[PDB]
């Protein structure tokens, strides 16, 4: 896939939680009209200048509209921004790892 | 805030040639491996029209003669070949971050063959005169290039005061410009003179195009 | 058929307020951002903000924070923009647009806002008749306020050869002219009429061009 990025908005269904492997889990629900589309996801430093962590979820896609999508990622140690969706209404979540 | 710098402010391109409009961002407009900048076209009296999204994705229904290119901070819009209908103002926009910002705009002038104006003079209407007004109207239509000067004469004497001029935007079909010149006088001054002259001077002739009427 | 129908042109005194409307149809109103863009006369575009009608989420450009207020009504599929403590810098065309995908795909026709203490006055419409081969006729739309006016020929039937000139401002009043060029065979045998509309004064004038 092949699908284009979701153009609409996301709602946080499950807030960031740390796993036993130090990774993070989040659940977001799509609100727009892209039907199946790739979730725009990126982890950055606080100045939004460098891309940092890695996605564990291979290619997160919205399958259904009103169904949450699980996203798991390995953030960098310290402070980072978990960025989800396009602007306006892009989610920018703070995270501190160990 | 991201600043979008468009250059040039304006450019004249001959029909069938290539037009390249530049647009530069003050910071990277990239996110998720995509460039969050887009190109719009605005024709006079109309809302803007989206041409290209995400730097290079042509909108449905827009001719493939329009192409977007670029990443991070440097972007270009290319129109090739340039057509008459392309006479408009082009804007770039970023929506990588809030507030979304636009460029200042680039006016694309379509460069065609020189054409002399079609001059028409009109006396004040009876309706206007019955209400104490007297406007003498002169149309200078379908000319190229845009540069033209109008001179009014009342019984052979030049008149500068009370003259209002207005130019149209470039015609989307024939690439020409048109202009209207209105000489407003009092019913009294109008009624005390006979000869009213509208003299147009354009690149197309060394001699001025002269249209007139006598109040008789 | 995606459509955004905006409310008509408005005049307001300095320090007053206006509430503009944008009726959306042809799509799920609650599944897209509805955005507002400002264009001052002879100037560029500026993004005011966006509203997500599904939950009333807004994003404003800082400069418009105190100035503009975005609301939306789910039931009537209508978005509104309220502009407060009006000043001359607020005189502009206000567009509503749908952010259909990655950018603004569908736009409303725009609402013109004139901030002035000047009095709304209807225009005087005068026929311009000649005193050969192709004949030029015209209409003079004199002394109106505020902008805009709508000029048509034969209720829109005559579209080719028409030149409606930008208005010129003199003594707080606008004056505009429109010309129509038609074959000699078509005038005066067939009627030529200019149709002038001034929304602010609720004026609609049809002026037949009769030969001199
Ligand atoms: Cl946008």
The total of other beta-carbon atoms located within 10 Å of residue B103's CB is 26
> How far is Cα B96 from Cα B54, in angstroms, rounded to an integer?
10
Contact A7 C101 (CB under 8 A): yes
> How many CB pairs below 8 A link B and C?
126
Element (H, E) at B43: none
The reply to whether omega before B8 is within 30° of 0 (cis) is yes
Whole-angstrom distance, CA of residue A86 vs CA of residue A88? 6
Distances (CA, A) of C41 to B178, C50, C112: 21, 22, 10
Distance A10 CA to ligand 1 centre (A): 17
Bridge-based pairing of strands C134-144 and C124-128 is antiparallel
Q: What is the C-alpha to C-alpha distance for residues B39 and B62, in angstroms, rounded to an integer?
A: 12
Residue A18: C-alpha distances to residues A15, A72, A73, A90, C105 (Å): 10, 10, 10, 22, 40
* Cβ-Cβ contacts under 8 Å, A87 against chain C: 59
**B136 bridge partner residues:** B183
Calpha distance C180→B139 (Å, rounded): 10
What is residue B27's three-state secondary structure? coil
Beta-carbon pairs below 8 A across chains A and C: 32
Query: CA B68, CA C48: separation in Å to the nearest integer?
Result: 26
Q: Find the CB nearest C126 among B38, B50, B125.
A: B125
Do the chains contact at C140 and B105, CB–CB below 8 Å? Answer: no
3-state helix, strand, coil in chain C (%, to 5): 5, 55, 40
Kindly state the DSSP code that residue A51 receives in the 8-state scheme.
B
Distances (CA, A) of B145 to B79, B111, B176, B178: 22, 8, 7, 10
CA–CA distance, A84 with A42 (Å, rounded to integer):
7
- Whose structure tokens read 């949450």? A68
Which of C212, C206, C163 minimizes the C-alpha distance to C187? C212
Residues 6+ apart with CB under 8 A from B106: B6, B7, B8, B9, B10, B11, B21, B89, B90, B91
Query: Cα separations (Å) of C168 from B69, C127, C165?
Result: 40, 18, 9
Q: Is C197 exposed, middle or buried (0-12, 13-18, 19+ CB in 10 A)?
A: middle
| Tokens representing residue C67 in the block | 């100035």
Ordered by where they begin, the domains of chain B are: 1-112 (2.60.40.10), 113-216 (2.60.40.10)
Q: What are the distances in angstroms from CA A28 to CA A72, A93, B152, C28, C50?
A: 11, 12, 72, 21, 21
Neighbours of C123 (CB within 10 A): 23
Q: Which residue has the tokens 């602010």?
A: C200
Contact B88, B43 (CB under 8 A): yes
Cis-peptide into A32, omega within 30 deg: no
Residue C64's closest CA among C45, C38, C100? C38
CA C158, CA C145: separation in Å to the nearest integer? 26
Query: For residue C59, what are the CA distances in angstroms to A41, C54, C177?
Result: 20, 14, 42
- Assign domain C118-209 to its CATH superfamily: Immunoglobulins (2.60.40.10)
Give the span between the Cα atoms of C94 and C96, in whole angstroms: 7
Q: Which structure tokens are listed for B181?
A: 């010149």
Q: How far apart are CA C4 and CA C107, in angstroms?
A: 6
- Chain C contact for B101 (CB, 8 A cutoff): yes
Intra-chain end-to-end CA distance of chain A, in Å? 35
**CA–CA dist B55, B96 (Å, integer):** 12
Q: How far apart (Å, rounded) are the C-alpha atoms in residues B211 and C126?
A: 21
**Does A40 touch chain C if contact means CB atoms closer than 8 Å?**
no
Q: Which of B178, B23, B26 is nearest to B99 (CA)?
A: B26
Burial of C159 (0-12, 13-18, 19+ CB in 10 A): exposed
Report d(CA B46, CA C110) in Å as an integer.
9
Query: How far is C18 from chain B, CA to nearest CA, in Å?
Result: 21
What protein residues have CB closer than 5 angstroms to ion ligand 1?
B 95; C 99, 103-104
Alpha-carbon torsion (C175, C180, C181, C183), positive or negative: negative
Query: In chain A, what are the domains?
Result: 1-98 (2.60.40.350)
Q: Where are the domains of chain C?
A: 1-117, 118-209
SS3 state at B168:
coil
Quick check: helix, strand or coil at residue C90? helix
Q: Indicate the pairing of strand C111-115 with strand C10-12.
A: parallel
Place of tokens 């409009």: B21
| d(CA C99, ligand 1 centre) in Å | 6
Strand B106-111 vs strand B10-14: parallel, antiparallel, or unpaired? parallel
Q: Of how many residues is chain B composed?
A: 216
First to last CA, chain B: 66
Pairing between β-strand B34-35 and β-strand C106-107 as defined by DSSP bridges: unpaired
Please give the Cα distance from A26 to C8 (Å, whole number): 46
Cα(C75)–Cα(C53) distance, integer angstroms? 10
Dihedral of CA atoms B25, B30, B36, B38 in degrees, nearest 10, equals: 50
Enumerate the β-bridge partners of residue B22.
B7, B76
| Intra-chain end-to-end CA distance of chain C, in Å | 48
| Separation of alpha carbons B180 and C85, rounded Å | 38
Q: Is B113 in the A-facing interface, judged by CB distances under 8 Å?
A: no
Measured distance CA(B64)–CA(B81) in Å, rounded:
10
C31 shares contact with chain A (CB less than 8 Å): yes
Residue with tokens 């739309």: C141
Which string of DSSP letters, residue by residue, matches B103-117?
---EEEEEE---B--
Q: Which residue in B170, B178, B187 sits closest to C178, CA to CA?
A: B178
């Amino acid at each position: 896939m092949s699908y284009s990025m979701c153009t609409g908005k996301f709602k946080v269904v499950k807030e960031i939680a740390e796993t036993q492997h130090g990774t993070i889990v989040i659940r977001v629900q799509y609100e727009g009209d892209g039907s199946p589309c790739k979730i725009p996801f990126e982890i950055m430093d606080l100045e939004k200048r460098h891309v940092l962590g890695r996605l564990i979820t291979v290619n997160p896609i919205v399958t259904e509209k009103d169904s949450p999508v699980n996203i798991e990622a390995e953030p960098p140690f310290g402070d980072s921004y978990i960025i989800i969706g396009v602007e306006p209404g892009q989610l920018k979540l703070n995270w501190f790892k160990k | 805030n991201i600043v979008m710098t468009q250059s040039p402010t304006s450019l004249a391109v001959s029909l069938g040639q290539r037009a390249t409009i530049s647009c530069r961002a003050s910071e990277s407009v990239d996110s998720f491996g995509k460039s969050f900048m887009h190109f719009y076209q605005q024709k006079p009296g109309q809302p803007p029209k989206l041409l290209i999204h995400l730097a290079s994705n042509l909108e449905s229904g827009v001719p493939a003669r329009f192409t977007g290119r670029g990443s991070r901070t440097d972007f270009t819009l290319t129109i090739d070949p340039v057509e008459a209908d392309d006479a408009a103002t082009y804007y770039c926009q970023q929506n990588n971050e809030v507030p979304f910002t636009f460029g200042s705009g680039t006016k694309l002038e379509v460069k065609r063959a020189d054409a002399a104006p079609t001059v028409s003079i009109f006396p004040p209407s009876s309706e206007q005169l019955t209400s104490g007004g007297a406007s003498v109207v002169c149309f200078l239509n379908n000319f190229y290039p845009k540069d033209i000067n109008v001179k009014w004469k009342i019984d052979g004497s030049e008149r500068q005061n009370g003259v209002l001029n207005s130019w149209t935007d470039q015609d989307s079909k024939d690439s020409t410009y048109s202009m209207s010149s209105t000489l407003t006088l009092t019913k009294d001054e109008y009624e005390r003179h006979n000869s009213y002259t509208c003299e147009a001077t354009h690149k197309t002739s060394t001699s001025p195009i002269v249209k007139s009427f006598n109040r008789n | 058929q995606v459509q955004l129908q905006q409310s008509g042109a408005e005049v307001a005194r300095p320090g007053a307020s206006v509430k503009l409307s944008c009726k959306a149809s042809g799509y799920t109103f609650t599944s897209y951002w509805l955005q507002w863009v400002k264009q001052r006369p002879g100037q560029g575009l500026e993004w005011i903000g966006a509203i997500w009608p599904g939950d009333d989420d807004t994003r404003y450009a800082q400069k418009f924070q105190g100035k503009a207020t975005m609301t939306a009504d789910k039931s009537s599929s209508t978005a509104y923009i309220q502009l407060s403590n009006l000043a001359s810098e607020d005189s502009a065309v206000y567009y509503c647009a749908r952010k259909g995908g990655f950018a603004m795909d569908y736009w409303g026709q725009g609402t013109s806002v004139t901030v002035s203490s000047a009095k709304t006055t209807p225009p005087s419409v005068y026929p311009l008749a000649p005193g050969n081969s192709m004949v030029t006729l015209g209409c003079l739309v004199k002394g109106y306020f505020p902008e805009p006016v709508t000029v048509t020929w034969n209720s829109g039937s005559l579209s080719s050869g028409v030149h409606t000139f930008p208005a010129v401002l003199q003594s707080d009043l606008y004056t505009l002219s429109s010309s129509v060029t038609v074959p000699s065979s078509t005038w005066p045998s067939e009627t030529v009429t200019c149709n002038v509309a001034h929304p602010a004064s609720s004026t609609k004038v049809d002026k037949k061009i009769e030969p001199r």
